[PDB]
């Protein structure tokens, strides 16, 4: 594995058109399937990515933690928890948009 970890894994995350403040706006704003989106709460904040659940209940779901295969280490110090960490989504099979989600913690701040 140490040899495998010479060359990192690759993702092609084509940020979709429709943005917003939160995954909520984004569903109202005509975005209506579950994938990765960029969002911006306040204007003085740099935008960031996030995986919105739209199918679950009534959509508008801003996923802020996920687990499903342990694929990411969580035994982290204060700072990585403050900034967030892990994969937001992953290229679903043979498509150009990241449809499946990845294990992450969207970060504290």
């Amino acid at each position: 594995q140490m040899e495998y970890c010479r060359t990192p894994c690759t993702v092609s995350c084509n940020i979709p058109v429709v943005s917003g403040k939160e995954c909520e706006e984004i569903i109202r704003k005509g975005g209506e399937t579950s994938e990765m989106y960029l969002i911006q709460p306040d204007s003085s904040v740099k935008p960031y990515r996030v995986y919105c659940d739209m199918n679950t209940e009534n959509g508008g779901w801003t996923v802020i933690q996920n687990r499903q295969d342990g694929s990411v280490d969580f035994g982290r110090k204060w700072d990585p928890y403050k900034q967030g960490f892990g994969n937001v989504a992953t290229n679903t099979d043979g498509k150009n948009y990241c449809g499946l989600p990845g294990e992450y913690w969207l970060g504290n701040d």
Partner: protein, 251 residues
Amino acid sequence: TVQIHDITGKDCQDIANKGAKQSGLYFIKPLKANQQFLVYCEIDGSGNGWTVFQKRLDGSVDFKKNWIQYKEGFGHLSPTGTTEFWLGNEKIHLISTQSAIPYALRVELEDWNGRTSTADYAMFKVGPEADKYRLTYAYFAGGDAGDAFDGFDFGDDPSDKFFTSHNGMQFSTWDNDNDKFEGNCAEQDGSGWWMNKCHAGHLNGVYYQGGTYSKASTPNGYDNGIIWATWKTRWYSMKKTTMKIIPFNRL
């Protein structure tokens, strides 16, 4: 792979004037817009900042969409431009309609033959949602594709050329009919454009794999596909398409 550059500006231009160089994705904030948004720039080795706002490529993204979708935008923005998309009318409007400097639309085109043709239009604007997002240019400015926005006589009718003229049309989607037709232009084609009765230009059409088709290709029998008569037959849908804009002095 997909990344975002740290250069801001009012349009893809102000980016290139500030220091840019790479055909890619950036954040622009036009004067009157409340919160900065993401566009796919297109810089050549010249200094030209082309804010792109439409693309077709393969058929992946489907353009049969509702009012609030076209208002806000739908599709995905590759920094290699390999992805279909509509940027969203509120954005178009916000970019183009900043004063003291008019833009100019460039439609670009391509076929399943390899040939590439352009067509230009002057003093470009899209009118507020108030005005139902209205297309208003000054003049066709040349290009081997042809002025399709100045109508076209198709079959038998004499004033169908008057009925397919596009300058001065409001945007019309199935759930917001603003086209001048007894029925709904947006619905018989399953798309969203500045329809009249109906169209001579239709960049947001139903993609076709191969290009050539007919009436028997759909239950309706209409020309839902991506067409632009001044360059091609109505029964031939483009492989690729584009629509970008740029401050006029750069022309």
